[PDB]
Amino acid sequence: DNKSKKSYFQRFQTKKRRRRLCKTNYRRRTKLIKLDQKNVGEDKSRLVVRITNSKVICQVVKSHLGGDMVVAQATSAELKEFGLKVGFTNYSAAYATGLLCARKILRMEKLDNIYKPKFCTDVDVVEDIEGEKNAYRCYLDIGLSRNSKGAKVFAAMKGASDGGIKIPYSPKIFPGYNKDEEFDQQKLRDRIFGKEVANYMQLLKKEDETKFKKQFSEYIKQNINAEDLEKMYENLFNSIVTKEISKKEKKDYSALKKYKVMKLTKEERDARVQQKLVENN
């Protein structure tokens, strides 16, 4: 019925572009970014965490009039520099990426030597050291992803905290929480260092060795075993904190402009129509 009459089209109002594309929630964005008129010089940084089929992305972003500015970035695909061979979208790889992201920031601001790392041994928020500069402050932006206990977005967030950035959070969201009992932190540590997957690998070899090969082929190719994971992850964390990856080079891929298609001229378009009439008669 609706689309049968011209007036439908003439009266229609389009949503904003990133809404048509289902990428942004405007009601959430406005609450997150809106300016406080009395706190002049406050310049809130969002920590943006997004998870793709391939990789984990952390970005630190400041919202300015005209467009958001990226302060710093880190990606799970870069951990290949420190010898990560497998599971680039794993719970551990989320945590590692948040850790990396934090360090890069505190180095630029030169806070790095004041606020030291701390590998997952409590659930308190980061606290300003007396007689020194204040901690760098951020708030979490989870986008369109759901909040639930043990979601991978919160792993990256704990990574950043352990790395030295101040984020307010409640422990309600982590594995090892209990409704009316103290926090069981060994369960949390367990997941960070990969116990959850070791326990699955061990099970399948008893159940079905065919299915095992199908499920874990990539691991087999690296000769990794369930026993090796803790050493792997301890090394990975230390190396992130210790080393720094080489700078990126700039290159003109300008010549790939050969591949871009170009629209027809008016002169062509007209002749084409003319020919179409003559082909029909």
Binding site: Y26, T30, I33, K34, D36, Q37, K38, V40, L65
Partner: protein, 156 residues
């Protein structure tokens, strides 16, 4: 007879324009305000807190005080044949920065150069005033290419 509620007679006012319904854009929230700026009121019907009374719609005033999400603006009004100042509270969603000072500020930037040189070299500024458009200018014309005009159109 008519009534006297707070939103009397606002059927035309306080309605959205064609194909412009919905909440405000980000630019509204990221604009910073300061005391002494001139600001201009235009109510957004979708926001129900911090609305001013409809007399003030489309009027321009001066910022007196700045709070978390609202502003206090000074206005003048005639009541009982006397002038009265009024202090109006408005939320930041219903205001836009006024353009009314634009030309004057440009002129001040030019004056600010001259007024310094006027101490060094002259004694008093030339001050660069505006002047209204004068008489029609003189013209020298080549006088080829004449066009004749006539009441040829009979207009039945």
């Amino acid at each position: 007879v008519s009534s006297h509620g707070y939103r009397r007679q606002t059927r035309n006012l306080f309605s959205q324009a064609f194909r412009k319904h919905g909440m405000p854009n980000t630019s509204t929230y990221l604009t910073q305000y300061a005391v002494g700026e001139y600001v201009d009121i235009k109510v957004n019907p979708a926001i129900h807190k911090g609305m001013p009374h409809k007399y003030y719609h489309g009027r321009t005033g001066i910022i007196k005080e700045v709070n978390r999400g609202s502003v206090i603006v000074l206005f003048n009004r005639i009541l009982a044949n006397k002038t009265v100042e009024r202090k109006v509270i408005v939320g930041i969603e219903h205001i836009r920065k006024s353009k009314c000072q634009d030309e004057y500020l440009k002129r001040l930037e030019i004056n600010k150069k001259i007024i310094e040189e006027a101490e060094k070299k002259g004694e008093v500024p030339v001050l660069f005033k505006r002047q209204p458009k004068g008489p029609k200018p003189a013209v020298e014309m080549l006088m080829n290419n004449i066009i004749e005009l006539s009441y040829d159109k009979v207009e039945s």
